[PDB]
Design an enzyme around this catalytic site. Structure first.
Site, PDB file in Angstrom:
ATOM      1  N   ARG A  62       0.811  -1.309   0.069  1.00  0.00           N
ATOM      2  CA  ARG A  62       0.100   0.097   0.081  1.00  0.00           C
ATOM      3  C   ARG A  62       1.027   1.329  -0.003  1.00  0.00           C
ATOM      4  NH1 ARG A  62      -2.813   1.625   4.551  1.00  0.00           N
ATOM      5  NH2 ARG A  62      -4.100   3.847   4.319  1.00  0.00           N
ATOM      6  N   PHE A  67       2.384  10.664   1.432  1.00  0.00           N
ATOM      7  CA  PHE A  67       1.836  10.074   2.719  1.00  0.00           C
ATOM      8  C   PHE A  67       2.519   9.294   3.386  1.00  0.00           C
ATOM      9  CE2 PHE A  67      -1.634   7.577   4.900  1.00  0.00           C
ATOM     10  CZ  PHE A  67      -1.246   8.142   6.064  1.00  0.00           C
ATOM     11  N   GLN A  70       3.658   1.361   2.838  1.00  0.00           N
ATOM     12  CA  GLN A  70       3.129   0.095   3.824  1.00  0.00           C
ATOM     13  C   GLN A  70       3.373  -1.057   3.278  1.00  0.00           C
ATOM     14  OE1 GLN A  70      -1.098   0.505   5.196  1.00  0.00           O
ATOM     15  NE2 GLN A  70      -0.786  -1.632   6.110  1.00  0.00           N
ATOM     16  N   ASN A 109      -2.160  -1.392  12.176  1.00  0.00           N
ATOM     17  CA  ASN A 109      -3.125  -2.327  12.863  1.00  0.00           C
ATOM     18  C   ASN A 109      -4.347  -2.158  12.588  1.00  0.00           C
ATOM     19  OD1 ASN A 109      -2.061   0.095  15.119  1.00  0.00           O
ATOM     20  ND2 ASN A 109      -4.306  -0.174  14.787  1.00  0.00           N
ATOM     21  N   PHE A 120       4.342   0.470   8.484  1.00  0.00           N
ATOM     22  CA  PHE A 120       4.393   1.442   7.495  1.00  0.00           C
ATOM     23  C   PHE A 120       5.548   2.697   7.778  1.00  0.00           C
ATOM     24  CE2 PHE A 120       2.288   4.984   9.509  1.00  0.00           C
ATOM     25  CZ  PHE A 120       1.892   4.303  10.788  1.00  0.00           C
ATOM     26  N   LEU A 129      -1.774  10.440  13.570  1.00  0.00           N
ATOM     27  CA  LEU A 129      -1.526   8.854  13.542  1.00  0.00           C
ATOM     28  C   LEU A 129      -0.972   8.719  15.314  1.00  0.00           C
ATOM     29  CD1 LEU A 129      -0.237   7.657  10.555  1.00  0.00           C
ATOM     30  CD2 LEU A 129      -2.485   7.646  11.468  1.00  0.00           C
ATOM     31  N   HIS A 133      -1.076   4.466  16.502  1.00  0.00           N
ATOM     32  CA  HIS A 133      -0.161   3.424  16.057  1.00  0.00           C
ATOM     33  C   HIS A 133       1.342   3.562  16.615  1.00  0.00           C
ATOM     34  CE1 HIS A 133      -2.563   2.529  12.634  1.00  0.00           C
ATOM     35  NE2 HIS A 133      -2.808   3.830  12.579  1.00  0.00           N
TER      36      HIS A 133
END
Ligand SMILES: CCCCCCCCCCCCCCCCCC(=O)OC[C@H](CO[C@@H]1O[C@H](CO)[C@H](O)[C@H](O)[C@H]1O)OC(=O)CCCCCCCCCCCCCCCCC
Ligand SMILES: CCCCCCCCCCCCCCCCCC(=O)OC[C@H](CO[C@@H]1O[C@H](CO)[C@H](O)[C@H](O)[C@H]1O)OC(=O)CCCCCCCCCCCCCCCCC
Ligand SMILES: CCCCCCCCCCCCCCCCCC(=O)OC[C@H](CO[C@@H]1O[C@H](CO)[C@H](O)[C@H](O)[C@H]1O)OC(=O)CCCCCCCCCCCCCCCCC
Ligand SMILES: CCCCCCCCCCCCCCCCCC(=O)O[C@@H](COC(=O)CCCCCCCCCCCCCCC)COP(=O)(O)OC[C@H](O)CO
Ligand SMILES: CCCCCCCCCCCCCCCCCC(=O)O[C@@H](COC(=O)CCCCCCCCCCCCCCC)COP(=O)(O)OC[C@H](O)CO
Ligand SMILES: CC1=C(/C=C/C(C)=C/C=C/C(C)=C/C=C\C=C(C)\C=C\C=C(C)\C=C\C2=C(C)CCCC2(C)C)C(C)(C)CCC1
Lengths: 174, 498, 144, 244, 143
Positions: A62, A67, A70, A109, A120, A129, A133
């Protein structure tokens, strides 16, 4: 600057291409094992492969430009797989660490206390975040390779069109 | 500026496509038109080699690049160097002489000469292709012409031979295509098939080994390597001798050319890994074929197994990582293209008179047919690695390349040097015996065989015109080596520390 | 052990400082040439013989055969370079400076001859080869 | 009618399969991918193996069609990312000409002859060289022989399969294509028999007649396509990757 | 209960503009495209989480945005009010990213959904959270 001292050092060998990727560089990640021992130990064991399963042959599944990249799904490669060395999921340790900027390696997660084998790397500041995370590492060398992974063309989802594969992962002693 | 190589490739097949516009019967006009096209093409390659090829240049020359398919990044790309011009000239010479020697063919002469010109074009397109997929296409473009030539102008077992040949070549060439797909898709950004940009590519050891195996299976099916050689005895034994020229003089050398161009040049690390195991295979191939040759009662099968034996020196020169070994391999390519084609031609012309197959019933042919006896003895001497011929100097240079090699140390360098030596003990043992069973002794022949039975002016000219370069190279080998001393060095430049 | 595993060794650097000052090696050296190991006496004999062989190269110098001049020069130059290294390394300590100076002058002449061959200039090739010729005659006179 | 059901049925069913496996069934791709992989591997293996033991031309063409459909299935299997659907077409466009030409030659041969057995195809080159040439070209294009449309179509189909990592499918396709030469060469081997004793009386009394007939035009619009599309395989795909 | 594990990073938080129907929404990104047309097929990207921030569904899991006919009640009422708009909710525009808090009465109600083989996908009386992203209006040809 680094938020904490690096205890253990891990590294990835990144290959991009289809069907067999060509090596593009090395990404070195320093683990903050003092503040988050279990998460750093899980990441190190998956990098080395002592438990039998590891990040070797897995892909960054991903990528969102400007950004995050991942990956860490060695089971299914779409985001629905990955097991920790303790069990399938393990509890979030604590959230003292912060997404201080580019190169931050944190855990992805499904929710609270659902950390697995998927990680990531952030490429910008992500202050939204935090407290959700578990941040456990910082990219020390190979940030240009991370940005090269980020610049990959993506499909209708966020999978790169060219498979970004971790050819060989391990530890670099220091 | 002018597309010389494109014209050279296109001209024979384009001219042979027009052979069906002729409404004439017989074979006279068809064969004269075909020989006109072949000689014009030969003069064209001679002009190209004389005025636009520089043997001192280790780079690619006369390159032409036209994009044909965008999806594969696939280009009609042509180019010659010191490695390719020798096989190109040999292809032109042998194909023109095979067209000349195929003149008694009166059954389906139009299709025969069209297939000959198609084979001309396909071989030249292979030897001057700088694109991997173009190389594969030109490699595949001969399955149908050789199949038709075998099945329509072959021997007693021509159909089984043709089926075995086409199936074996397809089985090798699918591995060739898999290697092409693997190498051409390794690019991180876009696929690429140009050999110039692929010569600088870096692979992991395992992937390079896999690609080398994929190419080497095809190049061992085509160039006879033990035990992928079983198509050759029945294919060459049951083929027309004019087609046998192309089969044993040109098509066999294509596997070696692919080994140098792809396995030796594009993938040097895997070649360094595989070469010591190729040396033992080549030595055992020499011994195995030189021992299989006395066991063959058929003459053409014996000559085919002799060709398999002679390919072992090329394999050794490939596997011995020296400039001298590669030069000896190229010299042996040229020598075998000059020797095997003439031997097959003489065998076919002799069978057209004697009409016998097995060697134990062809005694006394030297009495009605002395000139073919002389040519057969001379070309056997050339096969025998006799000095004054190209075979001796080729094998000697291969021996020197092994002795001067730095990869191997002492004992293997002994056990291989002894090895091929056993071969040049076994090579007389059948060959002279062949002559002793084919020309020596007395038999009472018919009075009608006293006149108009020996080789005519055409066959004498063909045998003489293939025999003269053998002597010319055995006296002065640098008539060939000087074309490729530079480029081979470049091929070797990747095998040392950098 | 039966065969080497990695890439073949390249040009081994000389330990007598007979190479070029800036690069450490000479341009005419060729990698992959088999040099037989004989010793100091055999290296001296081969040095004299190959100096005579290079002084046999008057006929090869011409407008059409400069590439063969370059090829023979590289071959024999590698041979005499490593033979000169061997004989200097086993020479007495008093005789090492003059031998090293003679080798340096000879290899500079080799470079000048190769440079003249590269530009395809025949009078320059002849003059550089004349200097090389007097140096080679000095070499055989020293090593007789 | 069987030629129609050979070319028209596969096009419509291929379109329906592509629009029913991608639009409403993309969430369960890991299941119908396996189903189509089995469906294709079994198809090539059991359509190319049985075709080499056939004594009838139409039945051999049937096993041929059920073999060539497995090559097209790879285009669905790889998906739209690594070309894919752009390799379904530019091969189905080939396949239409290949099958319609190799059925037009059969139509003319049966009408002038009155037979379907392969053994009666012997010696057609001596009687009608044009028909034998056209049928041989169609069959060699069917076998993926180099200068004809099937070869470039198959390498286009296999490039996307290799690009998607389907080594097993491409390997089975290449092995079955090797198996798919013995037939499409057996018919030609019969067509080039000059033995008058092996020539059936079905073709001994064969009249070509001095008229063109409509099927000759229809397959002259075809035989010149399966051979001269081999340069024009850059014009076709840019119309087939444009769709998505 | 039958939650498929999908690892996805969270979205930026918000203040929720509660409406009369009980739906909460915020405009993370205001789209510059056409607003969601009535009785039209639209492709959007969503990440459906339960309460306690556990994700149970995602269009990124399937690899392509979901196509639905909006405005005619082919989804849950909360999703229709969030996307199409109405009752104090402005319609979403193309390229807009919006968070949604669907209460149980606007979702699947007090009845569990997807019940088979001893488990259900969605429990009874569950508040859902949707990070919807209006990718665009459906078109037959992609670029
Ligand atoms: C010849 C085989 C022996 C060479 C070494 C093989 C090795 O190390 O594993 C090499 C290969 C594994 O293949 C490896 O895959 C990796 C994927 O992350 C990378 O592509 C590596 O480059 C590739 O070598 O072993 C296999 O599992 C394949 C076996 C051979 C397949 C052909 C069977 C027919
Ligand atoms: C017997 C000695 C005679 C020497 C000349 C003949 C050479 C025979 C070779 C066999 C032998 O004994 O060594 C057998 C070799 C000897 O070992 C090899 O040679 C050298 C050491 O002598 C180097 O170390 C090589 O790296 C090492 O691999 O053992 C192997 O490693 C064999 C394992 C690999 C086998 C793969 C076969 C590949 C075939 C591909 C075709
Ligand atoms: C051997 C046969 C092919 C010979 C080499 C092909 C290159 C020919 C000229 C160079 C070139 O770019 O041509 C380009 C050609 C033109 O073919 C197509 O033409 C179209 C015109 O509407 C567009 O230009 C397309 O982009 C182009 O691919 O590409 C080919 O496919 C070559 C064969 C043309 C068909 C001949 C029958
Ligand atoms: C115009 C130039 C003519 C050249 C001389 C022709 C010589 C000739 O015809 O001799 C033989 C052909 O000569 C050549 O092939 C000469 C080849 C020339 C090569 C010269 C270089 C070789 C040294 C064959 O003739 P014959 O009488 O032997 O034919 C009968 C037959 O042998 C048995 O029935
Ligand atoms: C170069 C490769 C030439 C042979 C392959 C080929 O193009 O196909 C056929 C060659 O086709 C021809 O015969 C030429 C006429 C059609 C043109 C097809 C393309 C010719 C080559 C184009 C460039 C390559 C081979 O079969 P055939 O048609 O010769 O079979 C015998 C026939 O029935 C006799 O009438
Ligand atoms: C590689 C090549 C080539 C070339 C070649 C050459 C270069 C050659 C040369 C050659 C030479 C330069 C030669 C010289 C001289 C010779 C001589 C001098 C001879 C003599 C002889 C005689 C006199 C006789 C003989 C005989 C015969 C014929 C047969 C039988 C036996 C006898 C032996 C008797 C060509 C082009 C083909 C093409 C391909 C490639």
């Amino acid at each position: 600057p680094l938020q904490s001292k690096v205890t253990n050092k891990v590294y990835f060998d990144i290959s991009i291409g289809n069907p067999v990727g060509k090596l593009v560089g090395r990404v070195v990640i320093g683990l903050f094992g003092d503040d988050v021992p279990q998460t750093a130990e899980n990441f190190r064991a998956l990098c080395t492969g002592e438990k039998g399963f590891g990040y070797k042959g897995s892909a960054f599944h991903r990528v969102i430009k400007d950004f995050m990249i991942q990956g860490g799904d060695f089971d299914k490669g779409n985001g629905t797989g990955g097991k920790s060395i303790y069990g399938r999921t393990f509890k979030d340790e604590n959230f003292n660490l912060t997404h201080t900027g580019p190169g931050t390696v944190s855990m992805a997660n499904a929710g609270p206390n659902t950390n697995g084998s998927q990680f990531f790397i952030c490429t910008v500041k992500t202050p939204w975040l935090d407290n959700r995370h578990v941040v456990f590492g910082q990219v020390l060398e190979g940030m240009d390779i991370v940005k090269l992974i980020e610049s990959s063309e993506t499909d209708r989802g966020d999978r790169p069109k060219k498979r970004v594969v971790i050819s060989e992962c391990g530890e670099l002693p220091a | 500026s002018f597309p010389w190589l494109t014209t050279i490739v296109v001209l024979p097949i384009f001219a042979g496509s027009l052979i069906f516009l002729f409404p004439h019967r017989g074979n006279k006009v068809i064969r004269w038109y075909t020989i006109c096209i072949s000689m014009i093409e030969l003069l064209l390659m001679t002009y190209v080699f004389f005025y636009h090829f520089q043997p001192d240049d280790p780079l690619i020359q006369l390159v032409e690049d036209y994009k044909w398919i965008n999806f594969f990044d696939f280009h009609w790309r042509l180019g010659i160097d010191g490695l390719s011009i020798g096989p190109i000239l040999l292809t032109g010479f042998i194909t023109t002489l095979a067209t000349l020697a195929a003149w008694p063919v009166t059954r389906n002469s139009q299709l025969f000469h069209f297939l000959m010109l198609a084979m001309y074009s396909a071989q030249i397109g292979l030897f001057s292709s700088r694109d991997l997929l173009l190389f594969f296409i030109m490699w595949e473009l001969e399955l149908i012409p050789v199949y038709l030539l075998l099945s329509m102008w072959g021997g007693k077992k021509r159909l089984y031979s043709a089926t075995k040949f086409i199936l074996y070549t397809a089985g090798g060439s699918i591995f060739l295509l898999m290697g092409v797909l693997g190498v051409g898709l390794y690019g991180s950004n876009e696929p690429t098939l140009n050999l110039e940009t692929l010569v600088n590519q870096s692979y992991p050891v395992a992937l390079e080994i896999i690609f080398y195996i994929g190419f080497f299976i095809a190049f061992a099916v085509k160039l006879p390597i033990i035990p992928l050689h079983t198509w050759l005895p029945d294919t060459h034994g049951e083929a027309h001798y004019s087609t046998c020229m192309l089969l044993a003089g040109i098509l066999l050398k294509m596997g070696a050319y692919g080994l140098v161009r792809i396995n030796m040049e594009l993938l040097p690390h895997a070649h360094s890994i595989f070469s010591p195991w190729l040396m033992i295979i080549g030595t055992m191939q020499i011994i195995y074929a030189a021992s299989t040759s006395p066991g063959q009662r058929n003459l053409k099968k014996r000559i085919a197994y002799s060709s398999v034996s002679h390919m072992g020196f090329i394999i050794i020169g490939i596997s011995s990582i020296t400039d001298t070994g590669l030069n000896g391999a190229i010299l042996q390519i040229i020598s075998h293209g000059f020797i095997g084609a003439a031997l097959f031609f003489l065998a076919g012309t002799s069978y057209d008179r004697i009409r016998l197959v097995y060697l134990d019933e062809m005694g006394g042919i030297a009495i009605p047919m002395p000139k073919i006896f002389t040519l057969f003895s001379s070309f056997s001497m050339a096969s025998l690695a006799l000095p004054g011929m190209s075979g001796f100097i080729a094998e000697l240079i291969v021996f020197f390349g092994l002795i001067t090699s730095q990869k191997y140390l002492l004992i293997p360098k002994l056990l291989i040097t002894f090895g091929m030596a056993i071969g040049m003990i076994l090579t007389p043992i059948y060959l002279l015996s062949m002559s002793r069973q084919m020309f020596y002794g007395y038999k009472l022949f018919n009075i009608s065989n006293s006149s108009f039975f020996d080789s005519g002016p055409r066959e004498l000219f063909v045998s003489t015109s293939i025999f003269l370069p053998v002597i010319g190279i055995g006296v002065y080998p640098d008539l060939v080596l000087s074309l490729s001393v530079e480029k081979v060095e470049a091929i070797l430049s990747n095998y040392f520390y950098r | 052990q039966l065969w080497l595993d990695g890439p073949l060794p390249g040009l081994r650097p000389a330990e007598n400082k007979i190479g070029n000052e800036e690069t450490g090696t000479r341009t005419f050296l060729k990698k992959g040439i088999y040099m037989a190991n004989i010793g100091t006496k055999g290296s001296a004999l081969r040095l004299r013989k190959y100096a005579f062989d290079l002084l046999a190269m008057e006929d090869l110098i011409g407008q059409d055969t400069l590439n063969y001049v370059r090829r023979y020069l590289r071959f024999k130059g590698t041979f005499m370079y490593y033979d000169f290294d061997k004989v200097i390394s086993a020479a007495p300590v008093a005789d090492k400076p003059p031998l090293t100076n003679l080798a340096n002058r000879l290899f500079d002449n080799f470079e000048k001859l190769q440079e003249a061959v590269k530009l395809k200039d025949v009078p320059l090739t002849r003059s550089c080869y004349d200097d090389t010729a007097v140096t080679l005659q000095e070499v055989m006179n020293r090593m007789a | 009618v069987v030629a129609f059901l050979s070319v028209t049925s596969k096009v419509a069913a291929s379109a329906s399969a592509t629009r029913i496996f991608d639009i409403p069934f993309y969430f369960s791709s890991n299941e119908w991918h396996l189903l189509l992989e089995i469906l294709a591997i079994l198809s090539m293996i059991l359509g190319n193996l049985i075709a080499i033991t056939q004594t009838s031309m139409k039945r051999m063409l049937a096993y041929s069609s059920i073999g060539q459909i497995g090559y097209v299935i790879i285009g669905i299997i790889v998906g739209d990312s690594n070309d894919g659907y752009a390799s379904m077409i530019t091969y189905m466009l080939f396949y239409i000409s290949m099958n319609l030409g190799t059925f037009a030659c059969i139509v003319l041969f049966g009408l002038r002859t009155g037979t379907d057995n392969i053994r009666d195809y012997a010696g057609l080159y001596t009687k009608d060289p044009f028909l034998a040439l056209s049928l041989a070209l169609c069959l060699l294009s069917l076998g993926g022989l180099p200068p004809l449309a099937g070869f470039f179509g198959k390498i286009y189909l296999f490039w996307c399969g290799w690009q998607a990592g389907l080594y097993f499918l491409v390997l089975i396709g290449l092995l079955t294509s090797v198996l798919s030469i013995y037939y499409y060469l057996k018919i030609i081997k019969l067509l080039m028999t000059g033995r008058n004793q092996e020539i059936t009386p079905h073709v001994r009394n064969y009249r070509r007649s001095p008229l063109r007939s409509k099927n000759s035009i229809e397959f002259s619009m075809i035989v010149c396509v399966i051979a001269s599309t081999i340069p024009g395989i850059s014009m076709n795909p840019i119309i087939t990757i444009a769709q998505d | 209960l039958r939650v498929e594990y999908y690892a996805t990073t969270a979205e930026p938080s918000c203040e929720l503009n509660l409406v009369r129907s009980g739906l909460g929404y915020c405009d993370l990104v205001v789209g510059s495209g056409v607003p969601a047309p009535y009785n039209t097929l639209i492709n959007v990207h969503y990440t459906a989480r339960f309460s306690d921030e556990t994700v149970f569904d995602s269009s990124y899991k399937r690899g392509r945005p979901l196509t639905m006919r909006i405005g005619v009640g082919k989804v849950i009422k909360g999703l229709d009010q969030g996307i199409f708009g109405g009752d104090g909710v402005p319609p979403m525009q193309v390229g807009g990213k919006r968070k949604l808090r669907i209460p149980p009465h606007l979702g699947y109600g007090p009845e569990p959904a997807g019940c088979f083989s001893g488990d259900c996908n969605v429990p009874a009386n569950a508040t859902l959270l949707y990070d919807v992203t209006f990718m665009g209006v459906y078109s037959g040809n992609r670029a």
